[PDB]
């Protein structure tokens, strides 16, 4: 096994290791517990969590850093979502809508914002997201 703990606490855990471009178990850990799951595979590792039919992908390592991926199953009312790489945010739309950011900060937490009916634009405040269970909330 190989266990990479970062600056800011968070870790990253590989286990039942084939080569070590290619890992079969791969798990994140960041602040408030929220642990994504996963492997590695050609040198990228793919972590993830399900609610539903949404999947949140999150890719480390690509000639890219990171990579946030959402995938969505479902015919109607599907969500999609754009990563931005300088700002390290997710932005989740449900059909032609924007619906909310998430943002991973540096320090390893995550926060929530949502856009206004029209889905052109933030509103309210940012706030923290404190488990798995609100994560995946994000995701209905």
């Given at each position: 096994?190989?266990?990479?703990?970062?600056?800011?606490?968070?870790?990253?855990?590989?286990?039942?290791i084939?080569?070590?471009?290619?890992?079969t178990?791969?798990v994140?850990?960041?602040?408030?517990?929220?642990?994504?799951?996963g492997s590695?595979?050609?040198?990228?590792?793919?972590?993830?969590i399900?609610?539903?039919?949404?999947?949140?992908k999150?890719?480390?390592?690509?000639?890219?850093?990171?990579?946030?991926?959402?995938?969505?199953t479902?015919?109607?009312?599907?969500?999609?979502?754009?990563?931005?790489?300088?700002?390290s945010?997710?932005?989740?739309?449900?059909?032609?809508?924007?619906?909310?950011?998430?943002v991973?900060?540096?320090?390893?937490?995550?926060?929530?914002?949502?856009?206004?009916?029209?889905?052109?634009?933030?509103?309210?405040?940012a706030?923290?997201?404190?488990?798995?269970?609100?994560?995946?909330?994000?995701?209905?």
């Amino acid at each position: 096994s190989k266990k990479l703990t970062r600056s800011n606490g968070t870790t990253l855990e590989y286990s039942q290791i084939t080569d070590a471009d290619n890992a079969t178990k791969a798990v994140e850990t960041l602040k408030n517990s929220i642990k994504l799951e996963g492997s590695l595979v050609v040198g990228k590792t793919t972590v993830e969590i399900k609610e539903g039919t949404v999947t949140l992908k999150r890719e480390i390592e690509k000639d890219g850093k990171v990579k946030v991926f959402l995938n969505d199953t479902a015919g109607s009312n599907k969500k999609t979502g754009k990563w931005e790489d300088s700002t390290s945010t997710l932005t989740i739309s449900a059909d032609s809508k924007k619906t909310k950011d998430l943002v991973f900060l540096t320090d390893g937490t995550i926060t929530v914002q949502q856009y206004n009916t029209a889905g052109t634009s933030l509103e309210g405040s940012a706030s923290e997201i404190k488990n798995l269970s609100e994560l995946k909330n994000a995701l209905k």
